[PDB]
Amino acid sequence: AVGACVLCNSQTSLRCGACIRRPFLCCKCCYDHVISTSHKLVLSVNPYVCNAPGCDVTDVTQLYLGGMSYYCKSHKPPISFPLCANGQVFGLYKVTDFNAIATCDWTNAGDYILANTCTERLKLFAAETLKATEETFKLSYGIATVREVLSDRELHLSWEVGKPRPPLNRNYVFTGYQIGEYTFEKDAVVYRGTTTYKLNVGDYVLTSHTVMPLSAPTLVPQEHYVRITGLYPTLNISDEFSSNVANYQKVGMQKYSTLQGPPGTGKSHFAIGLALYYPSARIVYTACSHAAVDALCEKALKYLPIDKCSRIIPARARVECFDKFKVNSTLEQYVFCTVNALPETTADIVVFDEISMATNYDLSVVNARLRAKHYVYIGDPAQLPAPRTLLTKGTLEPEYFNSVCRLMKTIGPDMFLGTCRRCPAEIVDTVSALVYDNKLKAHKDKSAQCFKMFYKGVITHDVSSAINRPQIGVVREFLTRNPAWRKAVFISPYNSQNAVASKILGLPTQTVDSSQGSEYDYVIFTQTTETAHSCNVNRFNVAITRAKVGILCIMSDRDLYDKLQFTSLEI
Ligand SMILES: [Zn+2]
Ligand SMILES: [Zn+2]
Numbered sequence: 001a002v003g004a005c006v007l008c009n010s011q012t013s014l015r016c017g018a019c020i021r022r023p024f025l026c027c028k029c030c031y032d033h034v035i036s037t038s039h040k041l042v043l044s045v046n047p048y049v050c051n052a053p054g055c056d057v058t059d060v061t062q063l064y065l066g067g068m069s070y071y072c073k074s075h076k077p078p079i080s081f082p083l084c085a086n087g088q089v090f091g092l093y094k095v096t097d098f099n100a101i102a103t104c105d106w107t108n109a110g111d112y113i114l115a116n117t118c119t120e121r122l123k124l125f126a127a128e129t130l131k132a133t134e135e136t137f138k139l140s141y142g143i144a145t146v147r148e149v150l151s152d153r154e155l156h157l158s159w160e161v162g163k164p165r166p167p168l169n170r171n172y173v174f175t176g177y178q179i180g181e182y183t184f185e186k187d188a189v190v191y192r193g194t195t196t197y198k199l200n201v202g203d204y205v206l207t208s209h210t211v212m213p214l215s216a217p218t219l220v221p222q223e224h225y226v227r228i229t230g231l232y233p234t235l236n237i238s239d240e241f242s243s244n245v246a247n248y249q250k251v252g253m254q255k256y257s258t259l260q261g262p263p264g265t266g267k268s269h270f271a272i273g274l275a276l277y278y279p280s281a282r283i284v285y286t287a288c289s290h291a292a293v294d295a296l297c298e299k300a301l302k303y304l305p306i307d308k309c310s311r312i313i314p315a316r317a318r319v320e321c322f323d324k325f326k327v328n329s330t331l332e333q334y335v336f337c338t339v340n341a342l343p344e345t346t347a348d349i350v351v352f353d354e355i356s357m358a359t360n361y362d363l364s365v366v367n368a369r370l371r372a373k374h375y376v377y378i379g380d381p382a383q384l385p386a387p388r389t390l391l392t393k394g395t396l397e398p399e400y401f402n403s404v405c406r407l408m409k410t411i412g413p414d415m416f417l418g419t420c421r422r423c424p425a426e427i428v429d430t431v432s433a434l435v436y437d438n439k440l441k442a443h444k445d446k447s448a449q450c451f452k453m454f455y456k457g458v459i460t461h462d463v464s465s466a467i468n469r470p471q472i473g474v475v476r477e478f479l480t481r482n483p484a485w486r487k488a489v490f491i492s493p494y495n496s497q498n499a500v501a502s503k504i505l506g507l508p509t510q511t512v513d514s515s516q517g518s519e520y521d522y523v524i525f526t527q528t529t530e531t532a533h534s535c536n537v538n539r540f541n542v543a544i545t546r547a548k549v550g551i552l553c554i555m556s557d558r559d560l561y562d563k564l565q566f567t568s569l570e571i
């Protein structure tokens, strides 16, 4: 019951009992929370409530200080002072944005906009409130019961009555009962057991968690040094990494640094190269996803001592991680760990990659568990953000993804990798104009294997996941005449479309959001629909920037189709 205001940092003992995170408020600000919102319960060592028997008066605007206890207007003694007096609430040591953040439901984009345009402490209140609201609601979907078990990879499901049903994507992970975590893909449903337990009938919940509080800021205050501080540069750096030396120096002359790395521009190369320039430094490589850390591991396995590297895995192990480094050895000079599994340690340089996919919660967790001399944030605000499962009204723009992306979109990034080495020029040219203001350059020539076709087709829906069978049919007609594409990866914005494409075409499939950070020779993309999800420029950017040799885009949107600097196909 001891703390300081979360708005002006004035110590007090008053906590709001209506806020889900019960923050500490001083006497001057508590008055504005209570007199401007619906939040009227104030908490202290003793609940501010009428102490008279049988009274339900909890509104502090209706309460009075009588003697040492608190009473309402119908029970207060003659000599009593109003608790809410002189723009203050009685407490020891005797706001609009805070009010919005405290009263919002996190379903509108404006909520997330405020949560990133506010003060740091407010940013941390919003983050923890959001996570809480996300969790307190994950308990309101129906439960799953197995009708019949057909194969080892497919089941029949029966859903509970009264509650809504959660979608069947990997984003919606489930805990089985403790038979292990499970994911489902949309009659028959495909099941994926983190273990090889033969899911039987009579078996049966959405994963959840407990919102631990936060303490560290999203970004530590910036520090600009006069020279490389805390690190010892080499003087014989491989020529393969020589282009990044001027950037590798800025990292050492600053507390934190921002790198915008468009697709195929060499982000992982910059990351592992930072260690070769500082060969004595302890480096923690972290990201929110397991695939990102594994990508950084695979890159290290080529340029770094395989004996100074460790892949930290959570004891609760769902996906397969990297199995070529020492597992769970925090003592190594090179530690590769997801944010949630971060140990409480120290380092010289911390590298946080895939920053577009980070939440302000993740950023705080890192600035806490990891105390370091230099933090490096690598990503691209023109790529996809982390899913905000409560956001249903409005679109979150890149400047509101997190604090780092806001910086990259407002003041600019500290470093910008401007040469794409992966994609054919046709792709590079298209994205450079679409999201990079023509600042992205192409190293490769035009492949002449980048084609586009405008075909709206027919849109069917499995619940809400979209499907366009006619667009799959067009792809089938294309594969019969382009054999070199039988190895192509099918990519779409919809899981259901991918499922239908797997069966009809036989190609490996991937959603755009799951394709992020992956590269492929040939890519086949069907927009499937003309929706805000299907036409998002970040999503379209990621999708087409996956191809190294060729791409075929079956388009549903006239604008994005015209912008594709590809050869048009007819059929
Ligand atoms: Zn205050
Ligand atoms: Zn409140």
Ligand SMILES: [Zn+2]
Residues within 6 Å of the ligand: 050, 051, 052, 055, 056, 057, 071, 072, 073, 074, 075
């Ligand atoms: Zn009373």
